[PDB]
Amino acid sequence: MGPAFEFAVAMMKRNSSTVKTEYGEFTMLGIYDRWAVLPRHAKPGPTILMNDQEVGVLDAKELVDKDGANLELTLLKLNRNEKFRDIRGFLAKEEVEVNEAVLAINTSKFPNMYIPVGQVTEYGFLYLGGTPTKRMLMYNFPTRAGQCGGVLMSTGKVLGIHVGGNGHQGFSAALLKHYFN
Amino acid sequence: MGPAFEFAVAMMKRNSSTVKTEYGEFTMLGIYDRWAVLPRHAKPGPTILMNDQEVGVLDAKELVDKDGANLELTLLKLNRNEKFRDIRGFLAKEEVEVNEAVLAINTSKFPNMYIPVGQVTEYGFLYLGGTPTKRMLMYNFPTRAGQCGGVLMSTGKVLGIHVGGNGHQGFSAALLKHYFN
Numbered sequence: 001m002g003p004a005f006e007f008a009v010a011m012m013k014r015n016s017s018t019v020k021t022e023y024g025e026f027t028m029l030g031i032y033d034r035w036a037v038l039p040r041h042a043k044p045g046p047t048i049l050m051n052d053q054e055v056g057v058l059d060a061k062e063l064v065d066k067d068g069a070n071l072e073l074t075l076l077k078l079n080r081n082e083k084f085r086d087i088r089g090f091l092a093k094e095e096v097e098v099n100e101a102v103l104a105i106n107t108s109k110f111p112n113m114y115i116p117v118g119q120v121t122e123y124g125f126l127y128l129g130g131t132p133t134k135r136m137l138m139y140n141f142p143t144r145a146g147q148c149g150g151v152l153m154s155t156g157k158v159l160g161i162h163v164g165g166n167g168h169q170g171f172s173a174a175l176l177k178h179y180f181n
Numbered sequence: 182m183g184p185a186f187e188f189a190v191a192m193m194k195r196n197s198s199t200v201k202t203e204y205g206e207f208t209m210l211g212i213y214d215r216w217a218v219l220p221r222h223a224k225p226g227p228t229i230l231m232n233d234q235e236v237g238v239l240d241a242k243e244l245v246d247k248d249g250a251n252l253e254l255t256l257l258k259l260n261r262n263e264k265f266r267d268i269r270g271f272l273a274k275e276e277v278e279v280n281e282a283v284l285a286i287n288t289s290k291f292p293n294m295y296i297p298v299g300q301v302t303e304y305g306f307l308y309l310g311g312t313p314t315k316r317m318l319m320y321n322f323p324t325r326a327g328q329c330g331g332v333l334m335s336t337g338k339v340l341g342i343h344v345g346g347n348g349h350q351g352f353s354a355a356l357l358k359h360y361f362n
Contacts, residue, residue: 001190002183009182009297105294111323113294116190142292
């Protein structure tokens with residue numbers, strides 16, 4: 001658990017930011033170049049607040065699989081002058097299962113917070129507010145209304161982005177290497 | 182940081198509960214026998230919600246030093262049939278300074294959450310909403326309106342109870358062994 005935590009803290013300090021869209025406040029993870037990821041529910045507009053600064057948005061892609069199934073992620077390309085530290089090496093080629101994970105949240109209502117959630121298993125397909133969603137990962141999480149965007153991590157791995165739960169389990173969209181390029 | 186986290190998780194699972202008084206929702210730490218501690222601002226009444234159950238309160242003591250100075254803690258004795266696991270061995274005889282600490286929060290709006298706050302130093306005397314307060318500990322904490330009751334911990338040590346901050350530093354009341362007995 002402790003190595004997962006030490007990994008998550010460093011990762012978050014290097015690659016995360018707090019974002020505000022018109023739909024609420026979220027944790028954002030920068031991935032490489034100018035591309036970051038948000039849960040789909042953040043619905044970024046042409047402009048966002050990133051760490052309380054206005055940043056333009058050049059492109060947003062709502063991700064679906066090869067047959068149009070929802071993946072519940074939005075990739076966004078930011079008009080900034082800095083690049084993100086490339087972390088594509090920490091993203092897996094397929095859904096990750098792990099014995100001990102930590103969910104990290106970085107928002108003005110949850111500033112730098114970390115939750116041990118224990119074991120992660122690949123759940124795959126489910127309904128999420130009625131919408132058929134694929135490639136979900138599941139773990140223990142006495143759950144909230146939103147507080148989503150969290151980043152799901154274990155030692156040396158970035159697993160996914162927290163997109164919701166049922167009150168007893170939490171669900172993350174698997175964050176796969178091939179989404180990027 | 183990681184050993185601090187592993188310590189805090191075990192400690193919280195064994196000795197903490199979520200409390201609701203009429204003044205809000207707080208993290209509570211059970212200490213031994215039937216005695217727990219809350220920040221002074223929780224103002225427990227004759228009854229509390231502990232993990233969503235009504236529990237009676239037999240005695241509440243607002244702690245002050247030998248010359249009546251505020252310490253910002255309330256010790257409360259609960260009418261329950263279980264004893265708390267004794268953790269007086271983890272409380273220090275005097276204010277603790279540490280290089281790496283973790284603040285742990287257990288509430289229905291922050292369920293099992295942990296914040297690395299880095300170094301803790303003994304601040305001693307300060308004003309806290311205008312009230313002269315002693316035996317404060319200080320650490321890094323991009324701060325909130327309440328979300329106090331948090332437990333401040335490092336590897337093998339329970340340092341204090343989070344009682345407020347200024348926006349850049351967070352403050353905990355030192356939780357001293359001799360308060361108990």
